[PDB]
């Protein structure tokens, strides 16, 4: 049967991911568990999942763990630092890679995985805004097979034929039948604000994370998602389009030649990714009651508009652009988002913040993690400049 | 192309038979075009023979035979000309060709779609009554001479696409459960009155039960594992469920060349001229189950399906008859359950083991739905 290393075990994906195993004892079996300073959380998991090894991202967070595994005499062995973390993502005996590790803390250790020709069931994003072309190139050479575990992606990935779902990223959408592919997304809570209300929206009116919350509305979460699966899906910017579906009943949609759509649907829950990924070719169940389409309200669908998401446009330039600017975009939305969230500045400031930095950009591209660290600082810098200059 | 597939088209003057000419004359590297096989329209066929210039075609009778091997001579055709359903068979059966669209209409299809199943070959399958008929035995062939079997109607082939490889290349013989799946969700508009005078059929949605049948048989589905449900606004075209609650679907527009396309292409695609779907023209989405009152017929399909294909093969017979009289004026609309239901229920039967067995309850089915018309 298969065998684990879970990348952030500790949190959210985490533990969605550790109740599939829970849920088929009989076919995943967890090899080794990693995550950065929650010890509590970790020991009773190593416990309960009695892992081979354990990392923690420090020292002092090892020796804790170590301690508390010590007094209940399991066999676990616990190391700490990103040479552990890496060294657990490419044990020859591990099957498949639960890259859970949030922001560019978790690049090193995704990459091992992937350099070990692992299934890697990819769940940090850092990963493919700032450096998908390095994490691609790494892909085709080890032949490792990545599975999205974000709905969207991993509602495209069930919408892909075989073919090419087995040879994620690298396989030639057009060659393999496919003509376009289609992101959704709500639209955020501002889809029927009249544009007058746009400059006076404030905190509370966007959070009630919180910082998804705002990039929800703004769409630059789905400008984010558009540029990780152009990467993801080996897609160019002709093959992708986004449709506003403010129901979120459909994940997302891939159109083919003949004029076939296939889409995936469902309720929203964590672990159907999670376990279609985890089993994948097979299927098991999770709890949630299936959907029902008596209960779901109608359906419906737009084109987004640019005037009221400007962001979503930014994010396809960037992405035309290059990894320096999505890098960039990336980096300068955290900053304005945090901006926005503190009242330094109006909503429809993020914008104009997020744009100004990227087409002040004049930087080479990043052909390493090292490279994008340091766009990633110097444009939170100028960033943050901008936030002070008005 | 060195990657010409050779086709036989069965029913090549009907509109399906055009749909799929349209589909070779987008891709004419990919698919060649071997033998036609129709009626007896016998200009429409000399058109698409002159267009095509296919090797062979037969027609229903020698007459007809006749006519359009003269029609080829004055126009210099090397187009050999046959007739009679052993021809339309053989031609069904070829070596050379690949694939094989039957989409002849009435009972009078099988003979020709059983040689195509027989002679394994992927067939394109239009054909309602090959299923309806005869579920049990065309599925023991399509088991036996591992054919390829890809649905044309629309919503079977929605189905079919929104289900494993593993399925669809084992079509009718492979276990859904054992391949992630858990129901397949059959989707039909439930027709204009969701009276005075196929319009029929969709309006008592017998042409639903009909379809569900087929779906029965055709993805080796238990009752169990198969909903209807009703989409008012047709663009989903049916779904499948898997058991991680996953749902795909397939969606589009009703131009039929996109299913046929996907069924000649298969396991790849090709573009076919179909304008793709606009979400900017699409209006909200419904979903409604279905009420067996308004759709007695529905509930009838169910039980005939779970009876056995005696009973299915009697309720098809027995509706039209029993629509062909409300038409022409002679019942009522609501009668044709109610006829329906006292035929199927009223005859002794055995399960057909044959094309041969199958027609003789056509006959008998018929004879009787036209008596309870009487009274
Ligand atoms: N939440 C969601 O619905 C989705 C999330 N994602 C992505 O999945 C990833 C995980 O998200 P989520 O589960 O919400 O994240 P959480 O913040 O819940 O948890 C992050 C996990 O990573 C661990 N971690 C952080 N830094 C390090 C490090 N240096 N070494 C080892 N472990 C570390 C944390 O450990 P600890 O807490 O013990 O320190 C924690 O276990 C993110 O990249 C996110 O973008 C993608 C799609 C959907
Ligand atoms: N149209 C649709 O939307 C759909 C149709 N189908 C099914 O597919 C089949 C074909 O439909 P469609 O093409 O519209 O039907 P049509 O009624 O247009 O024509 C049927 C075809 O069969 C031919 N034909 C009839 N009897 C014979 C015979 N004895 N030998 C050879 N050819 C014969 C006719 O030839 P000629 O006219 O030259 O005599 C004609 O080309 C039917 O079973 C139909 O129910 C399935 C799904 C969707």
């Given at each position: 049967m298969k065998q684990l290393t879970i990348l952030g075990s500790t949190g959210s994906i985490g533990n969605s991911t550790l109740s599939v195993v829970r849920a088929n004892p009989e076919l995943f079996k967890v090899t080794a568990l990693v995550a950065g300073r929650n010890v509590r959380e970790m020991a009773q998991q190593c416990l309960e999942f009695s892992p081979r090894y354990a990392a923690m991202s420090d020292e002092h967070s090892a020796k804790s763990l170590r301690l508390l595994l010590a007094e209940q005499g399991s066999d676990t062995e616990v190391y700490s630092g990103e040479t552990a973390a890496c060294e657990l993502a490419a044990?020859?005996?591990?099957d498949q890679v639960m890259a859970?590790?949030?922001?560019?803390?978790?690049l090193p250790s995704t990459l091992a995985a992937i350099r070990a020709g692992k299934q890697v069931l990819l769940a940090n994003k850092e990963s493919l805004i700032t450096c998908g072309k390095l994490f691609m190139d790494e892909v085709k050479r080890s032949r490792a097979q990545l599975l999205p575990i974000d709905s969207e992606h991993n509602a495209i990935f069930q919408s892909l034929p075989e073919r090419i779902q087995r040879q994620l990223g690298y396989s030639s959408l057009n060659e393999n039948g496919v003509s376009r592919i289609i992101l959704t997304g709500?639209?955020?809570?501002?889809?029927?604000?009249?544009?007058?209300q746009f400059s006076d929206v404030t905190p509370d009116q966007a959070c009630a994370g919180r910082k998804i919350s705002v990039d929800s509305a703004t769409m630059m979460n789905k400008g984010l998602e558009y540029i990780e699966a152009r990467w993801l899906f080996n897609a160019s910017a002709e093959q992708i389009e986004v449709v506003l579906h403010p129901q979120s009943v459909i994940h997302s949609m891939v159109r083919y030649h003949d004029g076939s759509i296939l889409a995936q649907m469902g309720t929203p829950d964590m672990r159907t990714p999670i376990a279609h990924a985890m089993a994948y070719p097979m299927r098991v169940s999770s709890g949630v009651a299936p959907l029902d389409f008596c209960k779901v309200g109608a359906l419906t669908f737009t084109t987004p508009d640019y005037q009221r998401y400007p962001c979503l446009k930014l994010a396809i330039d960037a992405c035309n652009a290059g990894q320096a600017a999505t890098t960039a975009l990336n980096a300068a939305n955290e900053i304005s988002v945090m901006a926005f969230l503190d009242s330094?500045?109006?909503?429809?400031?993020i914008e104009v913040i997020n744009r100004t930095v990227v087409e002040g950009l004049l930087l080479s591209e990043p052909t390493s993690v090292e490279e994008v660290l340091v766009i990633d600082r110097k444009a939170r810098d100028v960033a943050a400049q901008v936030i002070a200059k008005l």
């Open positions: 044990l020859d005996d591990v859970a590790i949030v922001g560019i803390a978790g709500s639209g955020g809570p501002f889809r029927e604000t009249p544009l007058s330094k500045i109006r909503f429809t400031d």
